[PDB]
Structure 1
């Protein structure tokens, strides 16, 4: 399979162009659009990379196009660990979908946060807030694909199945790629010497929801998460040999680019994914 990487939450992790030119990632999720819904003005946060206000982040279009020409699919990640992002109603879902279309997809806007580049899709990283209307948002976004260009739909649900926020949305069967987060969740993550919980969790995710492919989400380094880190050798010799048996196996997802560099994770596991 391939590796999906999250980019954008640390200005020292390099440009999007450099990130994709490493030839180690097949998918890149731009994190994050952490503010929207309930009447709020949508706002993107790319840490120290750029300031979105006044088109300060429109330069990212160069990276987006550079990645795409390399066959890499780039999605705008909604949510994240921090943010007042939410959906107050089904109408709110429609408004946000149209916003995303005109500002990040095939629509039109005089203030597209990341430039004129057309992202490949939208990533759902909803970890808190509203538990409703996310399935509506998925449906509305998906409906836009009928205009000519496919709007990819991906999701980063917590490993505890089913996911409290993305369960209904994933039940629609509209998602192409689902990278489950097997960390920051003791019941379904790796523990020194024990891979039972993560494997048992993987079996539940691959034998339920209907999506294109399912990925194994992990922290790129011990510092990347509070818990759940899996040493490269363990992943390679114990975990990958098992999860890769599933026909739905898509590969591995990593948080994040910054921590991948400091730990050299993808460089160690790439070929085994």
Structure 2
């Protein structure tokens, strides 16, 4: 039926802008990546491939007025991030709250200006569970203080996830987009979906969240392994996945590549 697609944005200086990405009409969620520097005596920092942070202010608002949810992803595939101590978790929690999830205050200054985002995406790929449980408890606390936003996670496809499984079991995430790529044990391999279908059954049965999305790379070049053509996703996957109460739609890695491949257009019947 209707399909919700989430896509990562911010992976290339030369990519279709954020507002044009929202104007495509293909996505329900746009995830800005990544706040990839924090913890360990480090001041937080963004690596959004050189796009001007402030320049994104009007674009985020345009996206939202067209009803596209805009999230900020912390961590990322690569980066000097870690949340080893309890004070790191608290520091990052209140920094994300003041500067991204709330309207402005004036003894500082929001990296994205006066825009307020719709949520935080945990894209933790190294460091173990550390204090990510604590970080999520505080963010979740604020969510219960009248400032509703969403908390999501992007775990690898092996269950349980070594870095986030512990935290996911707390059921704090509103949505999960499992990365069904870069790992042959649980993604599409050689005209072979057995590994993928098995991973999917596990995640949709055991994951403690309301929505589980299937994450795929939008182009053969976008990831080391796991690419599955659109026609095969609709034929192979969708019949068995819709049969799940937790089916959310799909997540695409990433915007820069979808612009090239037109994967989401093919998946949807190409359009707006």
- Confirm or deny a common fold (TM above 0.5): yes
CA displacement 1:49-94 (0-9 Å, x = unmatched): 22xxxxxx11211111111112211111011111011102122111
| Pair 1:83 & 2:83 matched | no
- Please tell me whether the aligned partners of residues 16 and 259 of structure 2 are also in contact (alpha carbons under 8 angstroms): no
Distance 1:223 1:182 in 2: 15
Indicate the residue corresponding to 1:134 in structure 2. Answer: 132
Distance apart, 1:130 and its partner CA: 4.0
| Pair 1:14 & 2:16 matched | yes
CA displacement 1:203-224 (0-9 Å, x = unmatched): 1101112112000000010010
Q: How does 1:36-185 map to 2 (within 5 A)?
A: 36-50=38-52, 57-106=53-102, 108=105, 110-185=108-183
- Please tell me whether the aligned partners of residues 97 and 141 of structure 1 are also in contact (alpha carbons under 8 angstroms): yes
Indicate the residue corresponding to 1:214 in structure 2. Answer: 212
Indicate the residue corresponding to 1:230 in structure 2. Answer: 228
Distance 1:2 1:155 in 2: 16
Distance apart, 1:271 and its partner CA: 4.8
- Please tell me whether the aligned partners of residues 129 and 166 of structure 2 are also in contact (alpha carbons under 8 angstroms): no
Q: 2:259 aligns with which of 216, 238, 261?
A: 261
Segment of structure 1 superposing worse, 6-15 or 104-113: 104-113
Distance apart, 1:41 and its partner CA: 0.5
CA displacement 1:75-122 (0-9 Å, x = unmatched): 110111110111021221111100100111116462311111111110
CA RMSD in angstroms, aligned pairs only: 1.4
- Please tell me whether the aligned partners of residues 105 and 119 of structure 1 are also in contact (alpha carbons under 8 angstroms): yes
Distance 1:163 1:34 in 2: 20
Query: Secondary structure of 1:252's match?
Result: strand
- Please tell me whether the aligned partners of residues 128 and 162 of structure 2 are also in contact (alpha carbons under 8 angstroms): no
Distance apart, 1:192 and its partner CA: 2.4
Distance 1:142 1:17 in 2: 29
Distance 1:110 1:271 in 2: 46
CA displacement 1:165-197 (0-9 Å, x = unmatched): 111111111101100000001100001221111
Distance 2:219 2:188 in 1: 13
CA displacement 1:1-36 (0-9 Å, x = unmatched): 300000001122121111111000000110000001
Q: Which runs of 5+ in 2 are unaligned?
A: none
Distance 2:19 2:194 in 1: 38
Segment of structure 1 superposing worse, 145-154 or 108-117: 108-117
Distance 1:271 1:152 in 2: 29
Segment of structure 1 superposing worse, 179-188 or 233-242: 233-242
Distance 2:93 2:86 in 1: 11
